[PDB]
Assembly symmetry: C3
Amino acid sequence: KVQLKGRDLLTLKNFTGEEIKYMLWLSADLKFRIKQKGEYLPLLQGKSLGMIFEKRSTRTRLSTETGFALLGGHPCFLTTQDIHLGVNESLTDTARVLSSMADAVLARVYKQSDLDTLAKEASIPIINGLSDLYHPIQILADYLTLQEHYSSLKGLTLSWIGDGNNILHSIMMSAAKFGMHLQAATPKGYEPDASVTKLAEQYAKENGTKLLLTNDPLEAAHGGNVLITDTWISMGREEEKKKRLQAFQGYQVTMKTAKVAASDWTFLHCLPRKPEEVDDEVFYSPRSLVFPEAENRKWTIMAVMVSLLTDYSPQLQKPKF
Amino acid sequence: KVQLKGRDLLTLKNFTGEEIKYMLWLSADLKFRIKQKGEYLPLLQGKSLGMIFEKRSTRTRLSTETGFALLGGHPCFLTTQDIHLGVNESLTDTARVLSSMADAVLARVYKQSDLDTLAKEASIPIINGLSDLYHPIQILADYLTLQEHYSSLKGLTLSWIGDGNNILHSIMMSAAKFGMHLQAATPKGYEPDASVTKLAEQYAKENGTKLLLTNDPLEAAHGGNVLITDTWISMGREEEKKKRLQAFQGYQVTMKTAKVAASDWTFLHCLPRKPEEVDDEVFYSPRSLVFPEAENRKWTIMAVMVSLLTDYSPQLQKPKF
Amino acid sequence: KVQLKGRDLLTLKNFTGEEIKYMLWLSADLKFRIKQKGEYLPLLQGKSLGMIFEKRSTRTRLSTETGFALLGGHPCFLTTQDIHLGVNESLTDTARVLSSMADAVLARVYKQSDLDTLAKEASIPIINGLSDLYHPIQILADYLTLQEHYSSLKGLTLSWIGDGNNILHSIMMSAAKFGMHLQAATPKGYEPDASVTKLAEQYAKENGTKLLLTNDPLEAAHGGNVLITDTWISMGREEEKKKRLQAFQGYQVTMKTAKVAASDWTFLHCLPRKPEEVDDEVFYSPRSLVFPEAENRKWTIMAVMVSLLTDYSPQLQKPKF
Ligand SMILES: CCC[C@H](N)C(=O)O
Ligand SMILES: CCC[C@H](N)C(=O)O
Ligand SMILES: CCC[C@H](N)C(=O)O
């Protein structure tokens, strides 16, 4: 049914519900075999990964590097300071050299269009490691964490409070494909991309789910099963700190926020977390799935790499979504 | 008898003579099997190490990275410039993410208290890769090198001449547990930490060894079997270069120093070495064990990682200490 | 016949035609077994490589790191910012520590004399990863690419147009040993090193090949089978940009250049490429072997490491040179 080998993964907008579910199935399979059964599975033996990072990273860096190596492959960490890209060489040429020396590329960038150039010019899989526009592999870890917590996903309401950024765009490109509703609050002027919203509206209609965009945190939180936030000042946006601290007043997730949420509410934050978006009482709550979520960045990028580079079939029974 | 799996290694003060001897036994075992018998021993297969470095490193970096990989594990080199730590994220949160993505952490830091926070907040082993206060894994290599040279350790007198720094603190936290005496000379005002000295005095009493602190290089060198020094200006102390070059005049180790030492004297320096602390005649002497010492950083960090992460038992006969 | 194990590879001037042919034979063997037959060949299992880079690199970095790891070894990427070299430690001492912790070193430097110090002071193989004077491992990839394209090398004329730099010096140290002629055009004042030219003249005489140095691009291109260029402003020469852009006017390789070349002409450029030295019509021509050339950096550095560190014999039939 699903065929993912050789594909790029630039955004979850290019993937069906069935395809994203397959990647979560594979994540759960690799997690069960390796973390629980202690198996060594050299699925990426004799393969290598080029990791280009234009921005700081703790989770994406660590999960990708230890995950690729745990399956027997070699991860090569490449920064702007060490390679010729931008400085002495074009992206087209860098993309062709990477194609002949590595089996895939994970690139954390500013411009999504750089990932498109890389995908068009390389004949190997290009995986988005975060861009200004989308962060698809984060949402993989998020939905796996919620499937593990709730034992299914269909009908959950996700409540975003915060900026209309890359994380919210990736939730918008995927939530409805799992039959989940989305209620999202951002400050006025900080809404998600109009083009992304338009396509999320279509997905909601196709899947019979609700999509609500608002500027009120408590309207977004009302009846939500999952409260989700992120930093108000994303990487590359630090010049706007003053204006954003003023615009985002009233948007911190607290227990007041949770008081309005469904009784089984949990909390997610992609991390790194600052004190502004969420207080400590929620962040370190027993309902906070923040550190399980961060661990699942590893099992899900492992599943991405296995499905884009091999013909491995999951032995695990498919999870209930 | 000895049980080290799961422990942290922040300082040798937390380890008994028996425990540190076990780590040297394991170092000798892994050195014999791999360097001499040429065996491939994948003891850390399917494991990973997070290496956080806040300071420059050639020996700790290389020994840890090639040693962890030689046992089949994957080392991930993380600097301040690339990860979010300090900048966008707290140490508590970084410690919890590292716990779920790696099997241990080696961290070279400024503040020893950062290693304590890391050890309390992570559920995986934290190994000190050097701090301003201690450098325990260096002394492991030092005592293995001296056991190899002398065929035992008990009753040796170590003569430190130089600064009251992290290397001298690690010798103070361990020498007496091996039945070795310590005679150490520092400039006035540059003495070892009062708290460390107090605990070294107790260890000397418990083990019936001598501890002598002095400001005279020749009193420290008198009758010593091993002359030991290090840079007068440690990393993070470069603002004090002028004051230290003036305070440390007369503290260079030369053949005049060795003339007063025991007849079988040898020399150690943790490296990197500068011309100030020791002259070339001693540093490149046939009695200088500096490069054997630096090689043993690899076999001993391999033994640290194996004992904190596995249940491997040494096949080698225990060395005479 | 050929015995290369334990040798350094600082320049192709120290290698006979037979020895360089053996390295190309081994490159073709490892390429056939791994790229075509899909074999996993752990020839460097239990080995490590220290990679010291003083300059930016995409191809040398990637080919060396993924190639060393593809054969089961561990590559350790060391920059000036992270290790003590230059700053707190001498090259002699760094060379001795690297000898006891790694099995070989690849070093991309400014000064060729730093590679000589490293080779004299270390007891492990030192491989040149590019210096201001030579880039031997690039020419290995170049001649393998041309052997694959033409099915032999003897009698080919290589036509260099550009600067008298490290790439042209490596061609001068090797072309005649394969029975290939060299016609090279540089601007006046930008000629190859007098000492290198003198030795290339001797090699041409010993092998009965022609060597022509000129300042005219079309004289160099006339009847040449391979047009070769590189940047006019090498790394470390950016202060001379103004003077070089003026001196090199008229030296861009275009189809006018190729109109004068042999009918079977191809094009090489070591990369990174800029618009100045060659136009797009030649660079992206079907006759341009630029990206095959860049891929062969990987199979040839793999062969270098295997021949300097093991006793592996090629199973492949020797290529026709
Ligand atoms: C993982 C960090 C996500 C955040 N929105 C950013 O782009 O900085
Ligand atoms: C390994 C270097 C040791 C020195 N005391 C320092 O802290 O810089
Ligand atoms: C691989 C780059 C070669 C160029 N001549 C340089 O030295 O910068």
